[PDB]
Design a protein around this ligand. Sequence first.
Ligand SMILES: [Mg+2]
Length: 48
Amino acid sequence: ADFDGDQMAVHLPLSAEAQAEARILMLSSNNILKPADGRPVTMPTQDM
DNA sequence: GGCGACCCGGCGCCCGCTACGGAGTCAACTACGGGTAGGGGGTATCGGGCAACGCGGCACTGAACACCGTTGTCATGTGCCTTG
Ligand SMILES: [Mg+2]
């Protein structure tokens, strides 16, 4: 997702189970490593 | 005469979402006959508006008895005086 111009859908987990999964499984901070080859993907390089 | 290419048909698909324009189009006819449906007309049936009149507590009716309280009342008992 570059910032040239891009829209991103936002979805709402409703049930207690859904927000539980989103809190535990689908969290942004528990997916540092890319599943393709198990290397970091959450440290981009453009500016920092 | 099954192999064989080849030929052909015939089919199967062809990243993701939002968000983003409108446009809308060429050749019968009449007669009948019914039946439904509308309209108003009139009619039986259901629904809305009022004071007595159901109640009840108690209250008055005190009236007529009852419940103590009272000073009415009586015939009948002590104390002093007179005579045996
Ligand atoms: Mg982009």
